Amino acid sequence: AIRKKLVIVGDGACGKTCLLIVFSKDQFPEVYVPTVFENYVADIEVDGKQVELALWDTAGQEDYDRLRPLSYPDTDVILMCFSIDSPDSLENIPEKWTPEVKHFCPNVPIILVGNKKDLRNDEHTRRELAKMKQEPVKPEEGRDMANRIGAFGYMECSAKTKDGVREVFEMATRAALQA
Amino acid sequence: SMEMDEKDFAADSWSLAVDSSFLQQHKKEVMKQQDVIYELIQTELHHVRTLKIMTRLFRTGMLEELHLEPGVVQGLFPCVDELSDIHTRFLSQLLERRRQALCPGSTRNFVIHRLGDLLISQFSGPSAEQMCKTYSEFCSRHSKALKLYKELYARDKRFQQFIRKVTRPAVLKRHGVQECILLVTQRITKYPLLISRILQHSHGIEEERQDLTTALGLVKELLSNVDEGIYQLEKGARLQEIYNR
Ligand SMILES: Cc1nsc(N2C[C@@H](C)O[C@@H](C)C2)n1
């Protein structure tokens, strides 16, 4: 098994911590959802190749521009997250997160991930966003942003229901293995 | 970690750690507050354990088995004794607050109602000045430590054998040298997230809400000071590269 490193980046409201927790336990916690994620090394076999995939969160580092980049050395794949219930989190992808990741992780594949996809058809979410003249992010808006920023690909998931979570980390492993 | 504390924090939450007959005596809001305080203490116990792996397993093992050039072990593990002293002392205070709160006849049933004052004390005065000085130094030496490790692992056979030997056990899976360094750098930025969530469930006693609000502000002041005090050191960087920053 070869060792690879994954780092997830995105705004504070993007759901990155929850995504790492649900993947690492293969379960949305039934009793207590942790506030923070330390690290984890997942054993993943993708397309016949065994990898030890180290997982890291940047939650808590969003306001600290000299501490945050210490998370990036030797990263092999980036998950760049936004929440589908927050068009504001998608707006910050090309102007802030993308230039930073391209600077500190040159040539590292980026997978743009739309989190909380279960909220796209949630009535409370649609009512709340309508007050700010907004609506949940459409799949084509996510794909277009991923295309514009030079992402390796675009994927969606729901940490709440686990749908799409395994597929995101298996694809991240395949991207990390590419030359 | 020692077995007594590992067992006390083995459960995924405070609600699963205490006896169910004790849990049922509390309101939902108290259970929510206690679950987050339990996560702050549990993650602090694990952070002190990361520092013990760095000092005892790695640093001391390299001094006792290998023939590294002087200053190499300090370069790999900058400030580790100072970091261990800071966090072992803080963990001791958190565990003593829990122990005093235990019901007589129990080693697991407790409620911590006054965490705010302990956090204000940790994040103010000389202990905050020592945390700021130590993390500004450690985080500025983080890149240099990772590069020194990579160079030694690629070029020194006895160093490679030592690392592969002590990191082979499954309990070290998440704790290689580079992983320990980043776990330590990331610890300080977990505190605001945990404190804000404890504060969300601490409105019942106004003095507690005010104390956690003060502690959250002190923690963010410490983080801002550390972040402004960092500049990565680089082996071989010339003075001209530094003064042209
Ligand atoms: C947090 C931070 N510290 S330095 C830096 N950048 C370097 C600059 C040349 O480009 C930008 C895109 C990213 N970003």
CSV table of C-alpha atoms and ligand atoms in Angstrom, one decimal:
chain,number,residue,atom,x,y,z
A,1,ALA,CA,0.0,0.0,0.0
A,2,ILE,CA,1.4,3.4,-1.1
A,3,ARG,CA,0.7,6.4,1.2
A,4,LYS,CA,-1.1,9.5,-0.1
A,5,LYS,CA,-2.3,12.7,1.5
A,6,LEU,CA,-5.7,14.4,1.1
A,7,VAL,CA,-6.6,17.9,2.4
A,8,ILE,CA,-10.1,19.4,2.3
A,9,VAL,CA,-10.5,23.2,1.9
A,10,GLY,CA,-13.5,25.5,1.8
A,11,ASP,CA,-15.4,28.1,3.7
A,12,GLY,CA,-16.4,27.4,7.4
A,13,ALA,CA,-20.1,26.6,6.4
A,14,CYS,CA,-19.2,24.1,3.7
A,15,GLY,CA,-19.5,20.8,5.6
A,16,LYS,CA,-15.9,19.6,5.2
A,17,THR,CA,-15.6,18.4,8.9
A,18,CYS,CA,-18.8,16.4,8.7
A,19,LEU,CA,-17.8,14.8,5.4
A,20,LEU,CA,-14.5,13.6,6.8
A,21,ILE,CA,-16.2,12.2,10.0
A,22,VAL,CA,-18.9,10.3,8.0
A,23,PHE,CA,-16.3,8.8,5.6
A,24,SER,CA,-13.9,7.7,8.4
A,25,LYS,CA,-16.7,6.0,10.4
A,26,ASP,CA,-18.8,4.9,7.4
A,27,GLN,CA,-21.7,6.2,9.5
A,28,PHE,CA,-23.5,9.6,10.2
A,29,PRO,CA,-23.2,9.5,14.1
A,30,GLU,CA,-26.4,8.6,15.8
A,31,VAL,CA,-25.6,10.0,19.3
A,32,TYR,CA,-23.0,12.8,19.0
A,33,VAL,CA,-21.6,14.5,15.9
A,34,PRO,CA,-18.0,15.6,16.7
A,35,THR,CA,-17.1,19.3,16.6
A,36,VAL,CA,-13.6,18.6,15.2
A,37,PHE,CA,-11.6,16.1,13.2
A,38,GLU,CA,-8.0,15.3,14.2
A,39,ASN,CA,-6.7,13.1,11.3
A,40,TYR,CA,-7.3,9.5,10.0
A,41,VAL,CA,-5.6,7.1,7.7
A,42,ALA,CA,-8.1,5.2,5.5
A,43,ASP,CA,-7.3,1.9,3.8
A,44,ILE,CA,-8.8,2.2,0.3
A,45,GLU,CA,-8.6,-0.2,-2.6
A,46,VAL,CA,-9.5,1.5,-5.9
A,47,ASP,CA,-9.3,-0.2,-9.3
A,48,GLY,CA,-7.2,-3.0,-7.8
A,49,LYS,CA,-4.6,-0.6,-6.1
A,50,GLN,CA,-4.2,-0.5,-2.3
A,51,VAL,CA,-3.6,3.0,-0.8
A,52,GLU,CA,-3.2,4.4,2.8
A,53,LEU,CA,-5.0,7.8,2.4
A,54,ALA,CA,-4.2,10.3,5.2
A,55,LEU,CA,-7.1,12.7,5.7
A,56,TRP,CA,-6.8,16.3,7.0
A,57,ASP,CA,-9.3,19.2,7.6
A,58,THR,CA,-8.5,22.9,7.5
A,59,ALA,CA,-11.5,23.9,9.7
A,60,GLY,CA,-10.5,26.6,12.2
A,61,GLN,CA,-7.7,27.8,9.9
A,62,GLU,CA,-9.8,30.0,7.6
A,63,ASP,CA,-8.9,33.3,9.4
A,64,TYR,CA,-5.2,32.5,9.9
A,65,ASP,CA,-3.2,33.1,6.6
A,66,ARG,CA,0.2,32.0,8.0
A,67,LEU,CA,-1.1,28.9,10.0
A,68,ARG,CA,-3.3,27.6,7.2
A,69,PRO,CA,-0.6,26.9,4.6
A,70,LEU,CA,1.2,24.6,7.0
A,71,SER,CA,-1.6,22.0,6.2
A,72,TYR,CA,-0.5,21.9,2.5
A,73,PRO,CA,3.0,20.3,2.2
A,74,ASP,CA,3.2,17.1,0.2
A,75,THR,CA,-0.6,17.0,-0.5
A,76,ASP,CA,-1.4,14.5,-3.3
A,77,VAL,CA,-5.1,15.5,-3.8
A,78,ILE,CA,-7.3,18.4,-2.8
A,79,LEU,CA,-11.0,18.3,-2.1
A,80,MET,CA,-12.3,21.8,-2.6
A,81,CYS,CA,-15.8,22.0,-0.9
A,82,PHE,CA,-18.8,24.3,-1.0
A,83,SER,CA,-22.3,23.7,0.3
A,84,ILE,CA,-25.2,23.4,-2.2
A,85,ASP,CA,-27.4,25.3,0.4
A,86,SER,CA,-24.9,28.3,0.1
A,87,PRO,CA,-24.3,30.1,-3.2
A,88,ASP,CA,-22.0,32.4,-1.1
A,89,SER,CA,-19.6,29.4,-0.4
A,90,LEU,CA,-19.4,28.7,-4.2
A,91,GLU,CA,-18.7,32.4,-5.0
A,92,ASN,CA,-15.5,32.2,-2.8
A,93,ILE,CA,-14.1,29.2,-4.8
A,94,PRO,CA,-12.5,31.0,-7.8
A,95,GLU,CA,-11.3,34.2,-6.1
A,96,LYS,CA,-9.8,33.0,-2.8
A,97,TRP,CA,-9.5,29.2,-2.5
A,98,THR,CA,-8.4,28.3,-6.0
A,99,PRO,CA,-5.4,30.8,-6.3
A,100,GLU,CA,-4.2,29.7,-2.8
A,101,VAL,CA,-4.3,26.0,-3.5
A,102,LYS,CA,-2.7,26.5,-7.0
A,103,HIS,CA,0.2,28.5,-5.3
A,104,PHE,CA,0.9,26.1,-2.3
A,105,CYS,CA,0.0,22.8,-4.2
A,106,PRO,CA,1.2,23.2,-7.8
A,107,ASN,CA,0.0,20.5,-10.2
A,108,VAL,CA,-2.0,18.7,-7.4
A,109,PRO,CA,-5.4,17.6,-8.7
A,110,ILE,CA,-8.4,19.5,-7.3
A,111,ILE,CA,-11.9,17.8,-7.1
A,112,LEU,CA,-14.7,20.4,-6.6
A,113,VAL,CA,-17.3,18.8,-4.2
A,114,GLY,CA,-20.8,20.1,-3.7
A,115,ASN,CA,-21.8,19.1,-0.1
A,116,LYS,CA,-25.2,18.8,1.5
A,117,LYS,CA,-26.9,17.9,-1.8
A,118,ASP,CA,-29.9,16.6,0.3
A,119,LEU,CA,-30.8,20.4,0.9
A,120,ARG,CA,-31.3,21.1,-2.8
A,121,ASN,CA,-35.0,20.0,-2.4
A,122,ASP,CA,-35.5,21.0,1.2
A,123,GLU,CA,-38.4,23.5,1.7
A,124,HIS,CA,-36.9,25.3,4.7
A,125,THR,CA,-33.7,25.9,2.7
A,126,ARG,CA,-35.5,27.2,-0.4
A,127,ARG,CA,-37.6,29.6,1.8
A,128,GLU,CA,-34.5,30.9,3.7
A,129,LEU,CA,-32.4,31.5,0.5
A,130,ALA,CA,-35.4,33.2,-1.3
A,131,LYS,CA,-35.2,36.1,1.3
A,132,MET,CA,-31.7,37.0,0.0
A,133,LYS,CA,-32.8,36.5,-3.7
A,134,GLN,CA,-31.0,33.2,-3.8
A,135,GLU,CA,-31.7,29.5,-4.6
A,136,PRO,CA,-29.7,26.2,-3.9
A,137,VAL,CA,-26.7,25.7,-6.2
A,138,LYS,CA,-27.8,23.9,-9.4
A,139,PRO,CA,-25.7,20.9,-10.7
A,140,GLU,CA,-24.7,22.8,-13.9
A,141,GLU,CA,-23.5,25.8,-11.8
A,142,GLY,CA,-21.2,23.4,-9.9
A,143,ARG,CA,-19.9,21.7,-13.0
A,144,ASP,CA,-19.3,25.1,-14.7
A,145,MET,CA,-17.3,26.4,-11.7
A,146,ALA,CA,-15.3,23.1,-11.6
A,147,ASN,CA,-14.6,23.5,-15.4
A,148,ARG,CA,-13.5,27.2,-15.0
A,149,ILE,CA,-11.1,26.6,-12.1
A,150,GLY,CA,-9.3,23.7,-13.9
A,151,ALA,CA,-10.6,21.1,-11.5
A,152,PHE,CA,-9.9,17.4,-12.2
A,153,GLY,CA,-13.6,16.8,-11.8
A,154,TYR,CA,-16.9,17.8,-10.1
A,155,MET,CA,-18.8,15.6,-7.6
A,156,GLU,CA,-21.7,16.0,-5.2
A,157,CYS,CA,-22.5,14.2,-1.9
A,158,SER,CA,-24.6,14.2,1.3
A,159,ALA,CA,-22.8,13.5,4.6
A,160,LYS,CA,-26.3,13.2,6.2
A,161,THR,CA,-27.5,10.3,4.1
A,162,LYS,CA,-23.9,9.1,3.1
A,163,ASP,CA,-24.9,9.2,-0.6
A,164,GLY,CA,-21.9,9.9,-2.8
A,165,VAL,CA,-19.4,9.9,0.1
A,166,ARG,CA,-17.6,6.7,-0.8
A,167,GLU,CA,-17.4,7.7,-4.4
A,168,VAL,CA,-15.8,11.0,-3.6
A,169,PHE,CA,-12.9,9.4,-1.6
A,170,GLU,CA,-12.4,6.5,-4.1
A,171,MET,CA,-12.1,9.2,-6.9
A,172,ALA,CA,-9.8,11.3,-4.7
A,173,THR,CA,-7.6,8.2,-4.3
A,174,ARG,CA,-7.5,7.6,-8.1
A,175,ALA,CA,-6.6,11.3,-8.7
A,176,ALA,CA,-3.8,11.1,-6.1
A,177,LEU,CA,-2.3,8.0,-7.9
A,178,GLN,CA,-2.1,9.7,-11.3
A,179,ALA,CA,1.4,10.9,-12.5
B,1,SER,CA,-1.9,7.9,27.8
B,2,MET,CA,-2.4,6.1,31.1
B,3,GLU,CA,-5.1,3.4,31.3
B,4,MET,CA,-7.3,5.2,33.9
B,5,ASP,CA,-7.7,8.2,31.6
B,6,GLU,CA,-8.1,6.2,28.4
B,7,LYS,CA,-10.9,4.2,29.9
B,8,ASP,CA,-12.6,7.4,31.3
B,9,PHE,CA,-12.6,8.9,27.8
B,10,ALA,CA,-13.1,5.6,25.8
B,11,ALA,CA,-16.8,6.4,24.9
B,12,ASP,CA,-17.8,8.4,21.8
B,13,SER,CA,-19.6,10.9,24.1
B,14,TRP,CA,-20.3,12.0,27.7
B,15,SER,CA,-23.9,10.6,27.3
B,16,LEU,CA,-22.4,7.1,26.5
B,17,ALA,CA,-19.6,7.5,29.2
B,18,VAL,CA,-21.9,8.0,32.2
B,19,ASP,CA,-24.3,5.4,33.6
B,20,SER,CA,-27.7,5.5,31.8
B,21,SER,CA,-29.5,6.0,35.2
B,22,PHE,CA,-27.4,9.2,35.8
B,23,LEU,CA,-27.9,10.4,32.2
B,24,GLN,CA,-31.7,10.3,32.6
B,25,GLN,CA,-31.5,12.7,35.6
B,26,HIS,CA,-30.4,15.6,33.3
B,27,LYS,CA,-32.1,17.9,30.8
B,28,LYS,CA,-31.2,17.7,27.1
B,29,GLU,CA,-29.4,21.1,27.2
B,30,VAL,CA,-27.1,19.9,30.0
B,31,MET,CA,-26.3,16.6,28.0
B,32,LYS,CA,-25.5,18.8,24.9
B,33,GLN,CA,-23.1,21.0,26.9
B,34,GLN,CA,-21.4,18.0,28.7
B,35,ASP,CA,-20.9,16.1,25.4
B,36,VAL,CA,-18.9,19.1,23.9
B,37,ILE,CA,-16.8,19.6,27.2
B,38,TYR,CA,-16.1,15.8,27.0
B,39,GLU,CA,-14.9,16.2,23.4
B,40,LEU,CA,-12.6,19.2,24.4
B,41,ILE,CA,-11.0,17.0,27.3
B,42,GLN,CA,-10.9,13.8,25.2
B,43,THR,CA,-9.1,15.6,22.3
B,44,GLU,CA,-6.7,17.3,24.8
B,45,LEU,CA,-5.8,13.9,26.2
B,46,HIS,CA,-5.1,12.7,22.6
B,47,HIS,CA,-3.0,15.8,21.9
B,48,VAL,CA,-0.8,15.2,25.0
B,49,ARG,CA,-0.4,11.6,23.8
B,50,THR,CA,0.8,12.9,20.4
B,51,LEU,CA,3.4,15.0,22.2
B,52,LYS,CA,4.5,11.9,24.3
B,53,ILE,CA,4.9,9.9,21.0
B,54,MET,CA,7.2,12.8,19.8
B,55,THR,CA,9.2,13.1,23.0
B,56,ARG,CA,9.4,9.5,24.2
B,57,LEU,CA,9.1,7.3,21.1
B,58,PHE,CA,10.8,9.4,18.4
B,59,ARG,CA,13.1,12.0,20.0
B,60,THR,CA,14.4,9.9,22.8
B,61,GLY,CA,14.6,6.8,20.6
B,62,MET,CA,16.8,8.6,18.1
B,63,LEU,CA,19.1,9.9,20.9
B,64,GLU,CA,19.4,6.4,22.4
B,65,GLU,CA,19.8,4.2,19.1
B,66,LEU,CA,21.1,6.5,16.3
B,67,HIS,CA,24.3,8.5,15.6
B,68,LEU,CA,22.7,11.7,14.2
B,69,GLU,CA,24.8,14.9,13.9
B,70,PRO,CA,24.3,17.4,16.8
B,71,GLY,CA,21.3,19.7,16.4
B,72,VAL,CA,19.5,17.2,14.0
B,73,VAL,CA,17.1,15.9,16.7
B,74,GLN,CA,16.2,19.4,17.9
B,75,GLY,CA,15.6,20.3,14.3
B,76,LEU,CA,13.2,17.4,13.8
B,77,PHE,CA,11.3,18.1,17.1
B,78,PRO,CA,11.4,21.8,17.8
B,79,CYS,CA,9.9,23.0,21.2
B,80,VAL,CA,8.5,19.6,22.0
B,81,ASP,CA,9.5,19.6,25.7
B,82,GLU,CA,7.9,23.1,26.1
B,83,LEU,CA,4.7,22.1,24.3
B,84,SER,CA,4.5,18.9,26.5
B,85,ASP,CA,4.8,21.0,29.7
B,86,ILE,CA,2.1,23.5,28.5
B,87,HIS,CA,-0.5,20.9,27.5
B,88,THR,CA,0.3,18.3,30.3
B,89,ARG,CA,-0.4,21.1,32.8
B,90,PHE,CA,-3.6,22.2,31.0
B,91,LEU,CA,-4.8,18.5,30.8
B,92,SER,CA,-4.1,18.1,34.5
B,93,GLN,CA,-6.4,21.0,35.3
B,94,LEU,CA,-9.2,19.7,33.1
B,95,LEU,CA,-8.9,16.1,34.6
B,96,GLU,CA,-8.9,17.5,38.2
B,97,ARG,CA,-12.1,19.6,37.5
B,98,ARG,CA,-13.7,16.4,36.2
B,99,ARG,CA,-12.5,14.3,39.2
B,100,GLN,CA,-13.7,16.8,41.8
B,101,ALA,CA,-17.2,16.8,40.0
B,102,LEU,CA,-17.6,12.9,40.3
B,103,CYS,CA,-20.5,11.7,42.5
B,104,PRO,CA,-19.3,9.7,45.5
B,105,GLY,CA,-19.3,6.1,44.7
B,106,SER,CA,-18.7,6.7,41.0
B,107,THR,CA,-15.6,6.9,38.8
B,108,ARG,CA,-17.7,8.0,35.7
B,109,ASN,CA,-20.7,10.1,36.6
B,110,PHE,CA,-20.0,13.9,36.7
B,111,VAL,CA,-21.2,17.3,35.4
B,112,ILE,CA,-18.7,20.2,34.8
B,113,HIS,CA,-20.6,23.5,35.3
B,114,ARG,CA,-17.6,26.0,35.6
B,115,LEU,CA,-15.2,25.4,32.6
B,116,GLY,CA,-15.1,29.1,31.6
B,117,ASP,CA,-12.8,30.2,34.5
B,118,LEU,CA,-10.4,27.4,33.8
B,119,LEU,CA,-10.2,28.5,30.1
B,120,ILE,CA,-9.7,32.2,31.0
B,121,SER,CA,-6.8,31.2,33.3
B,122,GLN,CA,-5.2,29.0,30.6
B,123,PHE,CA,-5.5,31.7,27.9
B,124,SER,CA,-4.4,34.7,29.9
B,125,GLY,CA,-1.3,35.8,31.9
B,126,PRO,CA,2.0,34.0,31.8
B,127,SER,CA,0.5,30.7,30.5
B,128,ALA,CA,-0.9,32.5,27.4
B,129,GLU,CA,2.4,34.4,26.9
B,130,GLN,CA,4.3,31.0,27.0
B,131,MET,CA,1.7,29.4,24.6
B,132,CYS,CA,2.2,32.4,22.2
B,133,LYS,CA,6.0,32.3,22.3
B,134,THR,CA,6.1,28.5,21.9
B,135,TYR,CA,3.6,28.1,19.0
B,136,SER,CA,5.2,31.2,17.2
B,137,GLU,CA,8.6,29.3,17.4
B,138,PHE,CA,7.2,25.8,16.6
B,139,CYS,CA,5.0,26.9,13.6
B,140,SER,CA,7.9,28.9,12.2
B,141,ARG,CA,10.1,25.8,12.3
B,142,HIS,CA,7.4,23.4,10.9
B,143,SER,CA,8.6,23.5,7.2
B,144,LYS,CA,12.3,23.0,8.2
B,145,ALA,CA,11.4,20.0,10.4
B,146,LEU,CA,9.5,18.3,7.6
B,147,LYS,CA,12.3,18.8,5.1
B,148,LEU,CA,15.0,17.6,7.6
B,149,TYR,CA,12.9,14.4,8.2
B,150,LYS,CA,12.4,13.7,4.4
B,151,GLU,CA,16.2,14.2,3.8
B,152,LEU,CA,17.2,11.8,6.6
B,153,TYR,CA,14.6,9.1,5.7
B,154,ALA,CA,15.8,9.1,2.0
B,155,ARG,CA,19.5,9.0,2.8
B,156,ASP,CA,20.2,7.3,6.1
B,157,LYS,CA,19.5,3.5,6.3
B,158,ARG,CA,19.6,3.2,10.1
B,159,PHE,CA,17.2,6.2,10.3
B,160,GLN,CA,14.8,4.6,7.8
B,161,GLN,CA,15.0,1.3,9.8
B,162,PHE,CA,14.3,3.1,13.1
B,163,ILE,CA,11.2,4.9,11.7
B,164,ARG,CA,9.8,1.8,10.0
B,165,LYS,CA,10.3,-0.2,13.3
B,166,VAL,CA,8.7,2.2,15.8
B,167,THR,CA,5.8,3.2,13.4
B,168,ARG,CA,4.9,-0.4,12.4
B,169,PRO,CA,2.4,-1.1,15.3
B,170,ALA,CA,-1.3,-0.4,14.3
B,171,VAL,CA,-1.6,2.0,17.2
B,172,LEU,CA,0.9,4.4,15.4
B,173,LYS,CA,-1.1,4.4,12.1
B,174,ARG,CA,-2.0,8.1,12.4
B,175,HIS,CA,1.2,9.2,14.1
B,176,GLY,CA,4.2,9.1,11.8
B,177,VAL,CA,6.7,12.0,12.4
B,178,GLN,CA,5.1,14.4,9.8
B,179,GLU,CA,1.6,13.5,11.0
B,180,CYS,CA,2.5,14.4,14.6
B,181,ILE,CA,4.0,17.8,13.5
B,182,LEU,CA,0.8,18.8,11.7
B,183,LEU,CA,-1.5,17.4,14.5
B,184,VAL,CA,0.3,19.8,16.9
B,185,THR,CA,0.2,22.8,14.5
B,186,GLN,CA,-3.5,22.2,14.0
B,187,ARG,CA,-4.4,21.8,17.7
B,188,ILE,CA,-4.5,25.5,18.5
B,189,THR,CA,-7.1,26.3,15.8
B,190,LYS,CA,-9.5,23.6,17.2
B,191,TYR,CA,-10.0,25.6,20.4
B,192,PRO,CA,-12.4,28.3,19.1
B,193,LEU,CA,-14.6,25.7,17.4
B,194,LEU,CA,-14.9,23.7,20.6
B,195,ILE,CA,-15.4,26.7,22.9
B,196,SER,CA,-18.0,28.3,20.7
B,197,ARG,CA,-20.0,25.1,20.7
B,198,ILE,CA,-19.7,24.7,24.5
B,199,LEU,CA,-20.8,28.4,24.8
B,200,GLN,CA,-23.9,27.7,22.6
B,201,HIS,CA,-25.1,25.3,25.3
B,202,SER,CA,-24.0,27.3,28.4
B,203,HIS,CA,-26.7,30.0,28.6
B,204,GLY,CA,-28.4,28.6,31.7
B,205,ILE,CA,-26.0,30.4,34.1
B,206,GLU,CA,-25.2,33.9,33.0
B,207,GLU,CA,-21.9,34.0,34.8
B,208,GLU,CA,-20.8,30.9,32.7
B,209,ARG,CA,-22.0,32.4,29.4
B,210,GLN,CA,-20.0,35.5,30.2
B,211,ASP,CA,-16.8,33.5,31.2
B,212,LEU,CA,-16.9,31.4,28.1
B,213,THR,CA,-17.4,34.6,26.0
B,214,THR,CA,-14.3,36.1,27.6
B,215,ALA,CA,-12.3,32.8,27.0
B,216,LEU,CA,-13.3,32.6,23.4
B,217,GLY,CA,-12.0,36.2,22.9
B,218,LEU,CA,-8.7,35.4,24.7
B,219,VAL,CA,-8.2,32.3,22.5
B,220,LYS,CA,-8.8,34.3,19.2
B,221,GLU,CA,-6.3,37.0,20.5
B,222,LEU,CA,-3.7,34.3,21.1
B,223,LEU,CA,-4.3,32.8,17.6
B,224,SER,CA,-4.0,36.2,15.9
B,225,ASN,CA,-0.7,37.0,17.7
B,226,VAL,CA,0.7,33.6,16.8
B,227,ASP,CA,-0.4,33.9,13.1
B,228,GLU,CA,1.3,37.4,12.9
B,229,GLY,CA,4.5,36.1,14.5
B,230,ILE,CA,5.2,33.3,12.0
B,231,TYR,CA,7.8,33.4,9.2
B,232,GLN,CA,9.1,30.0,7.9
B,233,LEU,CA,12.7,29.3,8.6
B,234,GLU,CA,14.6,27.6,5.7
B,235,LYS,CA,17.9,25.8,5.9
B,236,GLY,CA,20.4,27.6,3.6
B,237,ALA,CA,18.2,30.7,3.1
B,238,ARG,CA,20.4,33.7,2.7
B,239,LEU,CA,20.1,37.0,4.5
B,240,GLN,CA,19.2,38.8,1.2
B,241,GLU,CA,16.2,36.4,0.7
B,242,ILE,CA,15.1,37.3,4.3
B,243,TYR,CA,15.4,41.1,4.1
B,244,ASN,CA,13.7,41.1,0.7
B,245,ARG,CA,10.5,39.4,2.2
C,1,LIG,C1,-2.1,32.9,2.6
C,1,LIG,C2,-1.1,33.3,1.5
C,1,LIG,N1,0.1,33.6,1.9
C,1,LIG,S1,1.0,33.9,0.6
C,1,LIG,C3,-0.3,33.6,-0.5
C,1,LIG,N2,-0.3,33.6,-1.8
C,1,LIG,C4,1.0,33.9,-2.6
C,1,LIG,C5,0.6,34.8,-3.7
C,1,LIG,C6,1.8,35.0,-4.7
C,1,LIG,O1,-0.5,34.3,-4.5
C,1,LIG,C7,-1.7,34.1,-3.8
C,1,LIG,C8,-2.7,33.5,-4.7
C,1,LIG,C9,-1.4,33.1,-2.6
C,1,LIG,N3,-1.4,33.3,0.2
